Design a protein around this nucleic acid. Structure first.
Lengths: 96, 92, 102, 79, 74, 69, 90, 103, 95, 77, 79, 97, 102, 92
DNA sequence: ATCGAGAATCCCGGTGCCGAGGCCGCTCAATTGGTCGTAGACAGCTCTAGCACCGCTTAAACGCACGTACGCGCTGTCCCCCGCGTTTTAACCGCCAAGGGGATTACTCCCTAGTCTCCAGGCTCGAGCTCAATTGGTCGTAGACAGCTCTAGCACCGCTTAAACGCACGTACGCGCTGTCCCCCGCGTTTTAACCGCCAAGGGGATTACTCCCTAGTCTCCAGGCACGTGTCAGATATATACATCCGAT
DNA sequence: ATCGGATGTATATATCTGACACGTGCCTGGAGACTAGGGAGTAATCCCCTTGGCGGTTAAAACGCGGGGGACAGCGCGTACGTGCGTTTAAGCGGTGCTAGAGCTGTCTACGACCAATTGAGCTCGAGCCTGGAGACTAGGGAGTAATCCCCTTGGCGGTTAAAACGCGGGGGACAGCGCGTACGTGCGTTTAAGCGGTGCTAGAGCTGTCTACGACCAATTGAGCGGCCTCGGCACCGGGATTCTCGAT
């Protein structure tokens, strides 16, 4: 058996739009946060909830960005998102 | 170690609208964030209003105008109704 | 208590204190914390009403962040008011662009 | 070191799925990483600034909340 | 300024009436509104143009404006 | 009165915005957009005017509305 | 040997009825009054000379004050001088 | 009746007039000139004494000393400007440490 | 017990900016004044208040110069004043 | 006699001037500067003294010298 | 209107060159304009004051010379 | 082609302009500046020609001296580039600020 | 004339008149305008001497403001006397800080 | 329209010190500015001197002391020499 | 476009349970509250600029047809890039010890906000005196008119040097890093400058007899400030060597 | 570093123009005598007082000695900023020519500083009280510092499901071709907008003043949430239903 390209993708969309769990792995994200913070001030510590706050903010940001990116892809009569879609979305947002 | 929050008041309101409904700790945290956020917005706008008009006092008038500036449409009308009713009842 | 005098559940005295110590103005009228408390209480009530509704639609008796997000984003004016706000553990509204469907 | 690579291809795919994306170019993933890193940098910078102003060595949830608020990305739930 | 003074003023007074009766306007208030409106429209047309070009067109269309306004959060 | 914001004016605005070619349907669309933006700003401006207990909208009323938006 | 001490003291009693002043501080106030006198009188003298006038009038004093004093001090001083001359004249 | 009394002043109109006449400033002196000048001098004296009195009261002293005059003058932008090249004996300086020197 | 380098310096700054007393010793200053004066005019005497006037003026001058000098040191990202700081300050003053 | 203006005195003057740290070479430099200043003022003061045909330098002589050097002093009139 | 902008970047560069300056930060030019304007304002204010005292409507070279003199910037050549 | 290294032409310009005495600001724009500023004190003023020229000589002499002191401040900080903080230090020590 | 009696080129009579009408003192001694005229003449002579020198160094026969500026600024005492004075069209002394050179 | 200046005297001095040298109009204007400036400084200081000493007369003594106050070093000595010589020659 | 198997995923019903949700209470700790009264602060008070509204003008700008080519939409292909099957691993992560940092525990040290004792420092009627009110005719300075010229301003029209605007880079400064040296800090000693105290007189501040020297008013003369015609050194302009200095090369 | 070469600056240059300083002469106002007078300034002539002098005490300020950390100063490495470059345009400058306030000078008259006594009270000093403040002083707070404690980390040890990776093959992107259609320049009728005038007039703006608003302050109090106890219900899990895409066919 084999599902056609797109069927499982759509299924995944429904699945992940139904739920609320964080989609990035906890520990690797934590390492990311600590590395970046350490390049501003050495020997910093973190409250647990601070890292969790950062992850919620980051994932919400990326999900919204992917919504706008998707709209840009569809605008160009594509179904595939590409870097130029991201760049357009962010240019119009005033991030770039 | 004494930390104040709006939790018990949020809960009382919750029991008013949905008598048999509870709320998770995380959700309550979001509600507390909400109340503090709106507090800041309204108080700040009122402060600006009083300043613009060379008044040293923030009155219910500044609060109301701030509410009208910050809130959308019917939400603004309903909020103004609640505040006005509360102030007139308090005065009596 | 002033809250009882105003017919409110939210704390008028506390709101008054926070207004006094938030450096918003040199003076604060007697009606201002009452009005503010009433508004905060009302908005709390609207969000909790809608969130409770969502919770029951989902056959849940306890409100979780998901229900708050559903309540807010499915309501045009609340969505407007909290347009630049992130609800932790809220997720998003189910929505698939029509062109993507088979 | 190199922890941005911990933001994996399948993780980015999941984020995109929640964002309603059905199909994804191969170049998206690296692009996403760059974008994410910039975002994170900006938030954490401000957060650490608050931490430093308070003469603390521990970044608090409130430090992050303030950073986000002043960057126009108000976050509820961590006060 | 690229919009004519008198029709803009007329529009401003019309719109204002539906919020508050008996209003008057400072001259500089109407000029302020016009500077702000024109600046907004020019910026919106910049973004709209970017959307048109994104779709490999050189002609701006309503859907370009609508995409720009959706992404702006309008 | 919205029709007083003419086609050539909208064209001039678009040219400053760098637009080379323009669909016929743009103009009406632009008008709707303009109206919304004006209503929003003016709604706030007048609110300020009313708080000051004035009948004259000032430049500052407008500036404050714009700032808060 | 002249000084402004008694007049300084009268003014002091006007603005702060229960406040006194040390000898050194009074010496500094006297130095001050003489200094400003010299500045204003000198500028007025030059004003009169430049314009080939042999008389220093209140107008020269006023212009000299406008030249020598900054901002609000100049405006208030001009106001007091004008008021005093008006009260005096009648 | 004195001229100062007629002018509503405490500072000496007659003396100021004589000092103008004998200071080799001009061949002649108008009647209003010493009134105006005396009024200006009195005003400035009043402003300085007002602030200095305040500083004296903060220091819980009933007498104004040179220190209070220096504090009053240097903490007032326009007085400080007017007396920019003047040294007040026993006045000291304003407390002021550059931020970079602090821990 | 030993305060760290800088703590006592700062304490002294606060102390001496708080007060108004003359900071140079009376007798050596007087001796210097008479010595310098002798190379201009013979047989001179001095009023007491004349020497005190010279000292108030001198100390006010030095304190102000040290303020400017300090600004020059800080400009060069130092916290230590050096002769070149004084020389820059005096050159810009027109001295 | 210039060496009578001691290191701790110069340090006190610098502290009032807001200085936190001081190079060892400052003191001699300061002395030279002081001497020049004194010389100039005193040269003028004595000139006034001589014009008045006096042998005693007065406070006023000093005040006039200071004034004419753009360093007006209050308190000694 | 806005005539301070007539004090151009190359003019300010030339003035700096005569002042012995070899290299110039981009922010200098605006800074210079502000400084110049203040200076000019102060001189012209006094000059006009003299003009007004003389009951004239024409600012003379002497008005300017007097203003400059009383501001401790004596100018030779225009008496 | 040929290109002088950064600084060579600058030094050449220093020698050139320190050799000469001509005013370095354009006449007519300076005149407009003077008239605008004067008009904000009293309307309808006229100017003697030599009055405007006097003002220009004074202004340019002032700026050149200020640039000398500014340059000294830059060099003090072991820089060769003058910056706003150099100007501000020079003017603070001059007693202008 | 008094100038001839004093052996001077500068005008003693005129200087006397200017002293009388400058309101400097009620009375003026007979020697005062002579002394003043002599001093003014001398200082004029020193500046003109040095300026002439500069003019010839520049192979010019006519003194211009540049020569006056060179003369004054290259002389320590004249530079001191005219320390707060602007010479119109004088320019500045050639001087480049050593650290700026290649 | 009669305007007095020091031009001819400056020129006579110029011919004394540099017989074959001329001077531009601008330069002469600077010289006139110079003479007037120094006149003012010396006369003003002398006025102050006479005042300080309760004298109603400015004499050559006041001029001389003013010269010593205003002029630097050797310039002062030379100027004093010229003035003194001139006054003694005048007296005879 | 339309069932049908079926195996797959997902859903749906039931189970047991375990930690979150609910509930009090302890007390302390987060609320009001009566009276104060000065107070901003809001309500009555005028004048106005400027504001509303009008009463023309034509002309920049506004609308209406023409072709028309630029711009976009619609299909077929290519591929190749990504989506969905199996297979392997490695960091995730549960998850269970250990240690340095930091905060906050107390945990110690010199500075700090007030507490009284004893003045030297200002307040007070009495006794002078000299510097300031009171006029009268005075020039006489100047204020107000008034004509007349000058020149500051406007303003049109060239053109051309200069001012603006990218761009390739190439230093040049801003930050990191380290050795160090060299100046803060205190402490043990010593001067030696206060502190107090006494005397001599040198000089200075005031006093007067007088005097000469500097003002006042006059006469005339001329030196000299203003025009005016003139060589001449200053500037312009091609023209000319001699540096002056940046890519190759020791 | 040094030497060339190679252009590119700078610099005397000799020639011609030129305008501008200058020497001539020309009236007038300001200087120089010039006398007479009166008052600014001397030169004794004093009291006396302020300032050098000293002289002994001593107590703290200064000095020297030694010790450390931390500021200075290389030193380097980066990036990005300002520069040197050419190109384009735009506005300054010169020209030319009209102007219309306004300087400017002179005119006539009149306020009005002044000198001159003249009275006189404000000032000023004295001798004899009467206090804030200076110092000597305390009671508490400052922070500087560890100190142990707890937390956050680090690690370690699994096991493991997802991740990495691949295999493969199918389907969108996009492109080109062509249809194809609509703004748009364009040209001309139009029409009302902005300018230009204008008058009467409404609320905004500045203003005056009493009052009611609210910090405010322990005096009084009552509920709330950290802690803890207790309880179920949804969540993980196990097994049947549904449905359900995808091959099996048109």
């Amino acid at each position: 058996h084999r599902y056609r390209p797109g069927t499982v993708a759509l299924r995944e969309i429904r699945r992940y739009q139904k739920s609320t769990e964080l989609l990035i792995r906890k520990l690797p994200f934590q390492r990311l946060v600590r590395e970046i913070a350490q390049d501003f001030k050495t020997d910093l510590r973190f409250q647990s909830s601070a890292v969790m706050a950062l992850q919620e903010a980051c994932e919400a940001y990326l999900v919204g960005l992917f919504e706008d990116t998707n709209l840009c892809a569809i605008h160009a009569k594509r179904v595939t998102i590409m870097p130029k879609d991201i760049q357009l979305a962010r240019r119009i947002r005033g991030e770039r | 170690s004494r930390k104040e929050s709006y939790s018990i008041y949020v809960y009382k309101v919750l029991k008013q609208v949905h008598p048999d409904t509870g709320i998770s700790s995380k959700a309550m945290g979001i509600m507390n964030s909400f109340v503090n956020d709106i507090f800041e917005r309204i108080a700040g706008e009122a402060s600006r209003l009083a300043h613009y008009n060379k008044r040293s006092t923030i009155t219910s008038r500044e609060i109301q105008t701030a509410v009208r500036l910050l809130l959308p449409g019917e939400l603004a009308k309903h909020a103004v109704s609640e505040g006005t009713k509360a102030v007139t009842k308090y005065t009596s | 208590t002033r809250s009882s005098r105003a017919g409110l559940q939210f704390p008028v005295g506390r709101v008054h204190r926070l207004l006094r110590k938030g450096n918003y103005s040199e003076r604060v009228g007697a009606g201002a914390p009452v009005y503010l408390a009433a508004v905060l209480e009302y908005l709390t009530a609207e969000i909790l009403e809608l969130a409770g509704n969502a919770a029951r639609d989902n056959k849940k008796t306890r409100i979780i962040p998901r229900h708050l997000q559903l309540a807010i984003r499915n309501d045009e004016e609340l969505n407007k008011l909290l347009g630049r706000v992130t609800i932790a553990q809220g997720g998003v509204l189910p929505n698939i662009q029509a062109v993507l469907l088979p | 070191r190199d922890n941005i690579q911990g933001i994996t291809k399948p993780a980015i795919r999941r984020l995109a799925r929640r964002g309603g994306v059905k199909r994804i170019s191969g170049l998206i993933y690296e692009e996403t990483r760059g974008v994410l890193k910039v975002f994170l940098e900006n938030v954490i910078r401000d957060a650490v600034t608050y931490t430093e102003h308070a003469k603390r060595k521990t970044v608090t949830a409130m430090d992050v909340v303030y950073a986000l608020k002043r960057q126009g990305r108000t976050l509820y739930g961590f006060g | 300024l690229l919009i004519r003074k008198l029709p803009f003023q007329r529009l401003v007074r019309e719109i204002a009436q539906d919020f508050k009766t008996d209003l008057r306007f400072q001259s500089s208030a109407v000029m302020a509104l016009q500077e702000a409106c024109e600046a907004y429209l020019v910026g919106l047309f910049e973004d709209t143009n970017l959307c048109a070009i994104h779709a490999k067109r050189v002609t701006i269309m309503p859907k370009d404006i609508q995409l720009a306004r959706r992404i702006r959060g309008e």
